[PDB]
Amino acid sequence: VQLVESGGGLVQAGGSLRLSCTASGSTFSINAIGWYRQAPGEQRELVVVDSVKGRFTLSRDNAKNTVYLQMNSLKPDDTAVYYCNAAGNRLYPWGQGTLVTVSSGGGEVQLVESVGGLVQAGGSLRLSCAASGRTFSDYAVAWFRQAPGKEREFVAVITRGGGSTVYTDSVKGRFTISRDDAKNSVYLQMNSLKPEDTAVYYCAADFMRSTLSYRARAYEHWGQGTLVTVSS
């Protein structure tokens, strides 16, 4: 038996994914299969349209020996490595799995992020963020990001007046945060892009003067999210 799971990705909360599983090989591989979910830093558990969800749907295409999990109204809780196997029958050999990462911002002003991009490693890229409802001068503005199969992390922040900037260690040489209060925006210049930089980036703002915080929980205002993809 050669199980292969497919079709995972990095998506936003509220979004949707369809996972597929092709049972193959030189033995029977009966198609009464199910899905298993291993949350990062925990052991595999089972999920099946069964486990307390009006949101997932198990479905089949016998012609293909494929099983399908349609996932709607995704929550950050559904982040995990996803695997098909028996769930009667038992214990086929597990396949590599497929990774599912459901990104989410923390937490008036309406922050809007520029589009981001698909860019090759060691390239550059420039994110921009703009408050639409209000004067952004007054706000401390941070960037957070959420990469595949990781926790949401602090990237960078700039204070009102721009005289204080702080970067997470993994970025110190590469990204620069800055602002043009005249254009009502903040910018993240991203240099020497690397696989680790692929994530959903989030702009976030808070009114200060207070101590300069690096927790998402400290920031009332949050962009929708913008996707950065580094290839090579």
Side-chain angles (χ1 to χ4, degrees):
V1 185
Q2 289 167 342
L3 293 196
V4 177
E5 303 94 333
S6 198
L10 174 59
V11 85
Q12 183 148 38
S16 297
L17 292 158
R18 200 179 80 165
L19 310 171
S20 61
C21 163
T22 45
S24 296
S26 51
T27 79
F28 56 103
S29 89
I30 173 176
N31 191 338
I33 280 161
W35 286 94
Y36 293 94
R37 183 177 66 176
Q38 188 175 4
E42 202 175 310
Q43 301 185 338
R44 292 190 181 128
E45 183 180 19
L46 170 142
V47 280
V48 57
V49 50
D50 293 314
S51 303
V52 190
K53 289 153 180 43
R55 298 197 286 107
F56 283 21
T57 276
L58 167 68
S59 96
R60 313 179 175 103
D61 184 10
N62 290 118
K64 293 184 179 56
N65 297 137
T66 297
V67 186
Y68 292 111
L69 190 64
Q70 177 68 41
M71 294 190 283
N72 304 323
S73 296
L74 279 177
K75 291 203 289 189
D77 317 49
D78 309 328
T79 307
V81 180
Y82 275 92
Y83 303 97
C84 57
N85 229 53
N89 193 6
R90 214 73 63 194
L91 297 174
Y92 293 97
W94 304 103
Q96 289 185 303
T98 206
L99 176 57
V100 163
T101 326
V102 187
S103 176
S104 162
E108 75 150 313
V109 181
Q110 307 120 81
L111 302 170
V112 185
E113 293 98 345
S114 57
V115 86
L118 162 73
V119 69
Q120 199 189 356
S124 290
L125 189 58
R126 193 185 190 229
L127 303 197
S128 91
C129 186
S132 52
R134 285 201 73 168
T135 312
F136 213 20
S137 305
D138 307 339
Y139 291 89
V141 182
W143 290 93
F144 292 72
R145 76 184 176 193
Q146 181 149 20
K150 278 167 169 285
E151 287 197 63
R152 189 176 51 214
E153 61 167 336
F154 166 87
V155 176
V157 62
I158 186 175
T159 56
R160 180 224 300 266
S164 163
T165 56
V166 180
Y167 302 92
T168 201
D169 285 319
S170 69
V171 157
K172 269 175 190 176
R174 298 190 298 121
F175 306 171
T176 303
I177 189 173
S178 72
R179 68 202 296 155
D180 183 333
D181 294 315
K183 272 103 74 173
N184 217 56
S185 50
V186 163
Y187 302 111
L188 191 68
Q189 185 65 75
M190 301 166 89
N191 299 338
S192 307
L193 289 166
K194 302 177 170 184
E196 52 177 310
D197 298 341
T198 285
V200 171
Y201 287 72
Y202 293 105
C203 177
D206 207 57
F207 181 73
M208 292 219 169
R209 169 199 291 240
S210 317
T211 43
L212 190 49
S213 175
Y214 313 118
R215 304 172 316 286
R217 278 64 56 202
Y219 286 87
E220 190 184 338
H221 311 288
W222 281 84
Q224 193 176 44
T226 193
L227 176 67
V228 169
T229 284
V230 184
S231 59
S232 197

